[PDB]
Amino acid sequence: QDPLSCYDNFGNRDVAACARFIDDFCDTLTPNIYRPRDNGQRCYVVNGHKCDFTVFNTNNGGSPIRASTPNCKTVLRAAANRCPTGGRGKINPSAPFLFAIDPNDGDCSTDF
Amino acid sequence: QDPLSCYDNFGNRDVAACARFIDDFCDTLTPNIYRPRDNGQRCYVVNGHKCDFTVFNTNNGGSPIRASTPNCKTVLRAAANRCPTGGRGKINPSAPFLFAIDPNDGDCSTDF
């Protein structure tokens, strides 16, 4: 977990309710192959709000690649333990994938 | 493909550039088990815009379930063929999953 950055302190929702979904998100979305600058996401409903998870290939070019399941868990657990309103990061500075865990208002039915 | 509804969103791009991702999206995200009211999404870069795909469990309750891979493809191909700016639908009005294909401006790095 380096870099590891927290979202700001203005959010209304706590990340602790989202930690329960880290394993499911990492297990299901990391085996996919992602093109450079593409992402995969999942949305989970909890406590009248939602938890938005992202895996993002930060590479600008090169081959489409799959992500690391254990690295996803290490990063997102660190974010959940260190960032009360959620956060994002990579396993190490050179790693291609960024992972994010984001508690948000709303639900998983909107914007499509 | 009923309902099958085209988007009206101002400035949407042409869905034709996004059709290439239908099989990848459906193959990768439909086998996951989704709780009622949860979703999975992918964002794909193309032609300086992006393509936002969604699979959404419309059920309010009941056991968490995976989605149909062929139905995902049938619905999204119908959207790509009938809706120049993309759209959304289900295989039939009672089916649990809604699938969407949304060609629109931006990139896959926003909001996380």
Structure tokens at A56: 């993002």
Question: What distance in Å separates residue A64's CA from the closest CA in chain B?
Answer: 12
A40 touches B: beta carbon within 8 Å: yes
Chain B positions in Cβ-Cβ contact with residue A87 (cut-off 8 Å): none
Q: In angstroms, rounded to a whole number, what is the distance separating the alpha carbons of residues A48 and B104?
A: 29
| C-beta atoms surrounding B39 within 10 Å | 27
**What stretch of H or E contains B76?**
helix B69-82
Residue closest to B55 by CA, chosen among B91, B16, B9: B91
Residue B34, φ and ψ in degrees, nearest 5: -115, 125
| Helical H segments across B45-106, by residue range | 69-82
| C-beta atoms surrounding A96 within 10 Å | 17
| C-beta atoms surrounding B26 within 10 Å | 24
Number of Cβ pairs closer than 8 Å across A and B?
70
Q: In angstroms, rounded to a whole number, what is the distance separating the alpha carbons of residues A52 and A81?
A: 16
Please give the single-letter amino acid code of residue A70. Answer: P
Contacts of B8 (CB under 8 A, 6+ apart): B85
User: This structure's resolution (angstroms)?
Assistant: 1.2
A10 touches B: beta carbon within 8 Å: no
CB A72 within 8 A of CB A26: yes
Instruction: Give residues 79 to 98 of A whose Cβ lies within 8 Å of B.
Output: 88
